[PDB]
Amino acid sequence: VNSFSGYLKLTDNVYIKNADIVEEAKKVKPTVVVNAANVYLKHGGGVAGALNKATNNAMQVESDDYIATNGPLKVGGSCVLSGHNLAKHCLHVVGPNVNKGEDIQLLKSAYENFNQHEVLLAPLLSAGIFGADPIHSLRVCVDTVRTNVYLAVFDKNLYDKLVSSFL
Numbered sequence: 828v829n830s831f832s833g834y835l836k837l838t839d840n841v842y843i844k845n846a847d848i849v850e851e852a853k854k855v856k857p858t859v860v861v862n863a864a865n866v867y868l869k870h871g872g873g874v875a876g877a878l879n880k881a882t883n884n885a886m887q888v889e890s891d892d893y894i895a896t897n898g899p900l901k902v903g904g905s906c907v908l909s910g911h912n913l914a915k916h917c918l919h920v921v922g923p924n925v926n927k928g929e930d931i932q933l934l935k936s937a938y939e940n941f942n943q944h945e946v947l948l949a950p951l952l953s954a955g956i957f958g959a960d961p962i963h964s965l966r967v968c969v970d971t972v973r974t975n976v977y978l979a980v981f982d983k984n985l986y987d988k989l990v991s992s993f994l
């Protein structure tokens with residue numbers, strides 16, 4: 828039993844809500860919040876910019892030190908950093924940017940990172956500026972993640988569309 832509230836159950840292990848992941852994190856303070864990152868951990872907009880703003884830029888400061896030491900992430904890859912005031916940990920996950928010609932097959936690799944954590948609060952990956960089909964991303968999530976994932980989807984029209992569709 829956990830403290831997530833108002834989620835619609837999609838499968839044994841996947842749940843979804845029309846919500847801002849930032850607000851869900853502040854309310855729930857989960858063990859792991861997932862960031863929809865880029866390989867440089869430059870948190871400008873969308874999920875990443877919003878999470879970073881909520882940490883008063885501490886996420887960006889920590890991320891810049893990570894990159895200076897380790898170099899960029901791989902598309903499809905991830906790293907675990909602090910969750911700051913939002914969660915214990917933040918799992919920064921890079922989905923493919925379809926608008927940059929990156930292989931959509933890497934979306935499955937991106938979601939595989941979630942399986943290293945028993946419970947996660949997460950966004951849908953590769954949407955927004957990355958330009959992947961959100962219905963496809965949800966199907967990949969459901970067909971790839973085996974651990975317990977709570978998906979917070981910002982756009983009301985997007986949420987209504989996703990929960991009224993057969994995956």
Ligand SMILES: OC[C@@H]1CC2(CCCC2)CN1c1ncnc2[nH]ccc12
Nearest residue numbers: 847848873874877950951955980981
């Ligand atoms: O789940 C992925 C969705 C998809 C969006 C890009 C196009 C429509 C919206 C951004 N995003 C978010 N989801 C949950 N919390 C969020 N907080 C700030 C952004 C955000």
